[PDB]
Amino acid sequence: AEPVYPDQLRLFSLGQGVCGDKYRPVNREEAQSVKSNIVGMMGQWQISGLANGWVIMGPGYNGEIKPGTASNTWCYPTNPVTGEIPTLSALDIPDGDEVDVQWRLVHDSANFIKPTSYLAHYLGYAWVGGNHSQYVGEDMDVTRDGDGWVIRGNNDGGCDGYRCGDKTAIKVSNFAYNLDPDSFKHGDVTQSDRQLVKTVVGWAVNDSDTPQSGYDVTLRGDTATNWSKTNTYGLSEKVTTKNKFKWPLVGETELSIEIAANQSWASQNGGSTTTSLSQSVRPTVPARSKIPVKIELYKADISYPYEFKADVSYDLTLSGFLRWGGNAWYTHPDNRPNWNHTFVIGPYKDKASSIRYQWDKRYIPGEVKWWDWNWTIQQNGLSTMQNNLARVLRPVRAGITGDFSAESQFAGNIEIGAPVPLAA
Amino acid sequence: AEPVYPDQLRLFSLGQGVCGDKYRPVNREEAQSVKSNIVGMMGQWQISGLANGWVIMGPGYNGEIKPGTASNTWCYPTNPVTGEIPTLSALDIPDGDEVDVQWRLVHDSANFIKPTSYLAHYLGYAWVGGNHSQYVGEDMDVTRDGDGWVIRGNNDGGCDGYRCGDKTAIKVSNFAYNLDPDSFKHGDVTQSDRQLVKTVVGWAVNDSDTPQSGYDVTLRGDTATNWSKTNTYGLSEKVTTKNKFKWPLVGETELSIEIAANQSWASQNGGSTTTSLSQSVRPTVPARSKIPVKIELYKADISYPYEFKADVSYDLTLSGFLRWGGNAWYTHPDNRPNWNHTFVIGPYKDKASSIRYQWDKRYIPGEVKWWDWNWTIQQNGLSTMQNNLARVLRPVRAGITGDFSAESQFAGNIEIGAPVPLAA
Q1: What does each C-alpha distance from B90 to A177, A418, B107, B163, B223 come to in angstroms?
Q2: B274 vs A221: CB contact, 8 Å cut-off?
Q3: Contact with chain A for residue B193, Cβ under 8 A
């Protein structure tokens, strides 16, 4: 009923359905689901015990599952562990030009070069390392090629081994920069002093013999409030947001500012919104007198530095010849073929370029069309591959900074002046 | 980890990783990043010491970096200095016709001719100077050619040297004029006297036996306020602003005036906006009497001279033959080829025509596709090139003046007249 991950299966040679601690016999359906793996994990004429009086036979028997019994039995953890790839803390790159950010990314040995090199090594790529070292991911030269980057083992000096000198190459390209609204941060908030926006004056004249309250001067209508933004390092020209979001509330003044999706961050450097504030003055004027009235509207400015984080995605191409001894390609070629494969480090786009999709669906033999990650787990272990892929898929975020300003706080002043006799 | 600028590296011949004051040994990764420069800065079979027990070998060894040790060692400042091109104070040209502004720009020897001449000289152009002087950028003739300008060393009289008479030419063209809203300035502000815009009168008649307050006369609706602008010298026909901006607040009266981007400044010489002011009169009329009521609306005019600054950008083409001894083109040709290259003095447009981009990315050998600025630094020094490029890239701003007027201040008057008996 539940999915079965082949890496957790193990054969106990103890007797009829014995298994070990926290290990239970495997049933017929789970067997059939992972028959390819299980039969590849046993001898040609070997016969092993399943649950419910069933047995699975070796490749010589064509992997038949038949009712029977045997002295050994395949077993599965009663408390299986999830093999999901851990998500690590994001790697933060300081804001800068696009090329500078890429340069800082690809020259980080611990976080980029070594993880990708070890991934290529695990997948079966040959000569992932330079001649001046015997360890994977060492003595690697980084070069700028076109709009992308190439990391390749140094080939200077001599080398020993078959086709040594055909070093594996790791190519980075197709950089894209999203934007995370939730990553917003701001510096010191500066609020300017009240500034007089406009003023309207008037006179209320009463030449009658009784006081009059029948006056009304009203100032209303939409008042446009403008907001402005600046960009610092020029990477913003490539930054986009997949979903429209509102500018975050800073202080206690909400600005109805919308950032459009699928548009350059550097193109949206200003705008205006509407606020409706109305004021009115209705004086009571004594007989034979005039009263002056005034309505004033003031604005104020709020400004602060801003910093967002742009998620960085790219395309990682591994190019080189797969090792004869063992590689992770599902056909397991043994002719040392030249091979190129592109992964998309970032959001899912397709199954072939998605490490996470292939890793998660490794319990479905029919979905294994590119890489056999179960083979990698068997060769190197579950934890090792988990950590390596977590480092490879570690989120990378580039700073996006600037300055922001907006006319937000609005104030009013309504004045009824002293009466003046009409004799004037 | 951090970028390494080759101009700051220096070889100490002292012993095993000695270096000098505030100078540390260079590691393997930084070496590999700037290997081309470092290996070009050493002898064919020379061997120099890196950090962590590594050594870098000369061109004869093909620039190999291998674990080892040597009696000398490359070293890098522990407190590196930024080689960024300084930004100087803007050069202000008085407002005038386009041709006059260009004429004043290109005839400024100290600010335009000599800097560009020295830039061409540093890049390796030959004969940047006239025959009547032995110094660069002297005895240079300026001529109007089509819609652009040409500065070339005077070729009158005799000359000594190979291909003397093939003087280098500096061509200016492609002038563009932006506009900086923040550069706004205004002269003396003139406010006119209140002028009666409109008047509505009425009668409130009460033929009953009790006082009546049930009257209301209301004057409201949008009131169009017009603004006008004049242009003085005719350069405004070419002036445009990349971003829409609001007319600055002058005095304490905000005018909702928007200047459209990508449109001629001289085409936007007026407009109108809407302000909503409403007045009402609700008299209390005594029995058997009539009262006259009046509502008046007045406007006023605010006018002042205005001055903005238009940032001037242009295309600077250097044409001439590169010196055999040494030039800054990345291929370092030695056949004295005729060569033409255009820089864009102003906003970035492309890598090839951007001095700032090439200068900043000089630590990436793969981005060095046009000019080798590290070669210029080695030949002439960092400070010299910094100052020369700052003068070349010095911002230039042309005046844009005129007169501005707008109907801004609005006033009202509400009058309730004296009662008149109905016997009349």
Answers
A1: 35, 53, 17, 38, 43
A2: yes
A3: no
